[PDB]
From Swiss-Prot, chain A:
Family: Belongs to the rad1 family.
Signal peptide positions (record): none
The protein's name in its UniProt record: DNA damage checkpoint control protein RAD17
A GO BP annotation: DNA repair
Entry's localization field: Nucleus
Molecular function via GO: damaged DNA binding; double-stranded DNA binding; nuclease activity
Keywords: DNA damage, DNA repair, DNA-binding, Hydrolase, Nuclease, Nucleus, Phosphoprotein
Gene Ontology CC annotation, any one: nucleus
Note from the entry: Present with 189 molecules/cell in log phase SD medium.
Quaternary structure and interacting proteins, as annotated: Component of the checkpoint clamp complex composed of DDC1, MEC3 and RAD17. The interaction with MEC3 is performed in a RAD17-dependent manner. The checkpoint clamp complex loads onto DNA. Interacts with the DNA polymerase zeta subunit REV7. 2 RAD17 subunits also form a heterotrimer with one MEC3 subunit.
Gene expressing this chain: RAD17
Functional summary from the UniProt entry: Component of the checkpoint clamp complex involved in the surveillance mechanism that allows the DNA repair pathways to act to restore the integrity of the DNA prior to DNA synthesis or separation of the replicated chromosomes. Associates with sites of DNA damage and modulates the MEC1 signaling pathway and the activation of RAD53 in response to DNA damage at phase G1. The complex also physically regulates DNA polymerase zeta-dependent mutagenesis by controlling the access of polymerase zeta to damaged DNA.
Record carries keyword Cytoplasm: no
Amino acid sequence: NKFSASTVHLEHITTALSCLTPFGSKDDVLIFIDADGLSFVRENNHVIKIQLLLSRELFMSYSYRNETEDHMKLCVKINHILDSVSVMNRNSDDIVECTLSYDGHGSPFVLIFEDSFISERVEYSTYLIKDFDTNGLELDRERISFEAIIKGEALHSALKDLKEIGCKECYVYAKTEANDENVFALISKSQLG
Amino acid sequence: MKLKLIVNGCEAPDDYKLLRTTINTVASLRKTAILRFNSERLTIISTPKDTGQLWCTIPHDVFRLYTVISARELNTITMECNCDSLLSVFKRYDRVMNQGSSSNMTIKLQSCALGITFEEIVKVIMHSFKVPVKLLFRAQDTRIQEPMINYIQLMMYKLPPISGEFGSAFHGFIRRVERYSHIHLMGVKKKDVELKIIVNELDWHLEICWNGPLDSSTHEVIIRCKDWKVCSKLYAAFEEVVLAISHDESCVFHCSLDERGQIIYYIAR
């Protein structure tokens, strides 16, 4: 096997994958394997790009046996993975060990789940014919307009309050003042006004 | 035409007759149901004629006052009856497990039906139910319809139900298959042996190998239908151990052993 990874705490993996389901659930995720770790990227309509990265120390049996340029790509359907994983990873403290496998190229993405003497093994065939490579909506740091660091809970509350209002068009404001009264808000307009 | 017997169990045959009720359920699912009451010890009740047979003997030694007699010339007597009323009588019997030991029932082969009597107590209540259908057939039809005709080459011994997560694992596989709509079995001789099951589709591929191998040629790939749920339900058999065998890449058995009431259900390609 070219790529191998094992984990014991699937709660982190499933709660990371739950953050990708609103739009990435359909298909066309381009998983990357390198020395840094495991990453997933989703891009639809070339309007938004998401990258979720898994580090080396997250996995317990990371081997990564390779003799190449150290960058192999694969595209797999997310919906099949979600349908497979929905039935498993049930209950709590089920100590479900997940094993990842990928034999370089031409082999399906292999997941092994073991739960109380019961093992499962699902093969995910990939799609690597019209992979145009490169891609990526990257930006240069030499001309950053502004930088902001905010708490996750406040942003989550703001977004969950904004969602049910509507507001099909939203605005982002940035403002700094001499008296350290910095201004940052996400205003929007809707049928409500 | 006198077929009278008394059913009364205390410890062991209660689970056995519950298993008989499950056999009656699957026979109601089955198209036909035939019986071959013969002598007093070996009374086969293989009710089937898809392409499945459910050969299983009945140890009537514990039963009291059981006799068989008919005008079928030889010792073999054909008997076919509808098991829909058997479910009703069995569940009404199972409802009175709180109290009542001498009630029991007595079924007799009459010229039109088969009456069943009850003596339950809530002051006693008597219930009389007659079996609707008892259509018999020729002895030639019985002798031209014979089970077995098979050999054994690669036996797959299966562990007793002391480990409850094993039957639970197969039940989980059954409900997984039901939720996600073939059941490919595999077995190897590489020593303890490994049991692996595979299901595949156009874009679906799932294979399960049960960990912690305690079950006692190789590379036997077999493709079959999804009629193995009845064997999975039959595996319960809390009294004793259940065996199995799969070979020839086209046939697989399910040997349930529960005085040895061997129960085998036949599976074709």
